[PDB]
Symmetry: C3
Subunit: 68 residues, 3 copies
């Protein structure tokens, strides 16, 4: 009787939640795809930040030698 | 409609509890899409900039070979 | 009021089902915020690196115009 009332709300709610679970599963995979793309970008920027720091010091040391 | 009535009011009662869940989700779906287009714009800017630096380092390597052996 | 004992039993079923949904969401909200700050840090690092490369390509375009003059 109250066990029916619970079963009813459980199944009414689980069918309402099928779209919510689908919406979430697609967000979890799309969020994981972005996190690996951002991991690949940060690595690609950590290997090209030094060469530009070397380039700006070469610009600073050639400015000091042109003054002489 | 006796228990069928019960099930139908329970559905629209359970739909009320879910309208914050649906709003929380819709804001995540738009914010996740905004990030995915910003990350798409970043990766193609980096895919344009990675080759010219690879060409630059080979020009530095081939210049080093011709300089010390001259 | 026995309608309070009914609600208390019912509400445990709703809680049982949405607790994982709320936890799934809260972990997405924090993980989505982490990537939005990482993407904000990447865009400002690229906004400071994009001008120096546009200055470099115009220096390459100016020297090409000067080499034509001989």
């Amino acid at each position: 009787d109250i066990i029916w009332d619970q079963l009813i709300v459980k199944r009414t709610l689980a069918d309402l939640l099928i779209p919510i679970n689908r919406q979430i599963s697609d967000i979890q995979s799309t969020l994981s795809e972005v996190t690996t793309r951002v991991h690949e970008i940060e690595r690609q920027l950590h290997e090209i930040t030094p060469v530009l720091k070397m380039g700006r010091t070469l610009e600073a040391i050639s400015k000091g030698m042109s003054e002489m």
